Amino acid sequence: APAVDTAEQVYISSLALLKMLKHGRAGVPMEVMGLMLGEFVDDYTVRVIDVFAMPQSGTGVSVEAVDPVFQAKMLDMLKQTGRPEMVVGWYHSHPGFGCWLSGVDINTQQSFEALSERAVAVVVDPIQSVKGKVVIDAFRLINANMMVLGHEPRQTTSNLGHLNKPSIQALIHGLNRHYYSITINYRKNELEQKMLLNLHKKSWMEGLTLQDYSEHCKHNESVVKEMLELAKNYNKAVEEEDKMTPEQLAIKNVGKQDPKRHLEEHVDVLMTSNIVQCLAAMLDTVVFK
Amino acid sequence: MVVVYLASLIRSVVALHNLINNKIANRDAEKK
Amino acid sequence: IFLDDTQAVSDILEKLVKEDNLLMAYQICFDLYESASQQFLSSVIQNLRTVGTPLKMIKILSGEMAIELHLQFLIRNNNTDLMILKNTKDAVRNSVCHT
């Protein structure tokens, strides 16, 4: 008798995530929105193949902005391209607080829920993401009807479970009025990883590319000058280091942290550039000749 | 290297001492 | 159980039955049940009937008899409580907790 109607953990592909990060980033401080297109298969996997933004909101994520007309217009085009996909849900950005929906935004969310139950709402914070998986949650709408049914525990079931974190006021308020939180996990294929990496032609070529001989000599001499400074501290540190922990001994008989370490880093950078250039130089001269 | 060795020498005294303490405890028991 | 040759097993029981050491034949079958794969124990049953090894071996290898044997330890020294079932209705929401 009962149905499913649960929020499944959302599989976001590599291109779709980048499109959401880019949409938001240009889009903020203004609240903006756009749609998510994908295919849902099984009762566990929704894959977000692609997204595009369906005209960006003004003040609030307004109920005016949700447009069946634009949604319809875009959808028939896709059919002609020979990629017919369905709206899996929709995403929006809030810079207000991490993982929070606005008051206007919950009403807007309801239009998508009526269309498909598997409509999801993704909050993107470009302000507070410097890993870009961080401060993104998938959410689901809480109506009066949803709370009476007990749809909210029903969502945690069928996946790994996920609650938000950013800000104290936004977590209590959001949880009660605005949403229930559910999980996003990521699948990106090996081809997606290969394109992600940015193989680049000059990037590898530099490794062989020979730097000036005078420049190595000059550098060798400069590097020695840093060690000289460290060398006064280093002569004093070495006299007594007859107990345990080198760092304590070194600070105690003068020389902040490790005078040995500083000295070593200084040679390593010079040695690294000189060593590779010599390896490269001998090789190129013989090969080209 | 030299620093870890000076410490290593100090560790040696405790580590030797443990094998002898056991000896002394075994003997106090057998002698009563 | 390591060899996993059904023909080897049938031969040990046959010799112990012919000697009229039925008990001995019997022990190997209960010992075998615990460790072995079920597929492997099934093949033995077909082979034993045919040699004319007694019917007794067949029941234990089936794995129907073994459940009942466990029951006396569990049933005698059985802990139960109603209280957890009730805790989940009253305290917390039911779906995640309920399973």
UniProtKB/Swiss-Prot annotation, chain C:
Functional summary from the UniProt entry: Component of the 26S proteasome, a multiprotein complex involved in the ATP-dependent degradation of ubiquitinated proteins. This complex plays a key role in the maintenance of protein homeostasis by removing misfolded or damaged proteins, which could impair cellular functions, and by removing proteins whose functions are no longer required. Therefore, the proteasome participates in numerous cellular processes, including cell cycle progression, apoptosis, or DNA damage repair.
Quaternary structure, from the entry: Component of the 19S proteasome regulatory particle complex. The 26S proteasome consists of a 20S core particle (CP) and two 19S regulatory subunits (RP). The regulatory particle is made of a lid composed of 9 subunits, a base containing 6 ATPases and few additional components including PSMD1. Interacts with ADRM1. Interacts with ZFAND1.
Residues of the full protein shown: 221 to 367 of 953
Name of the protein described by the UniProt record: 26S proteasome non-ATPase regulatory subunit 1
Domain of life: Eukaryota
Name of the encoding gene: Psmd1
Residues modified as Phosphothreonine: 53
Record organism: Rattus norvegicus
Family: Belongs to the proteasome subunit S1 family.
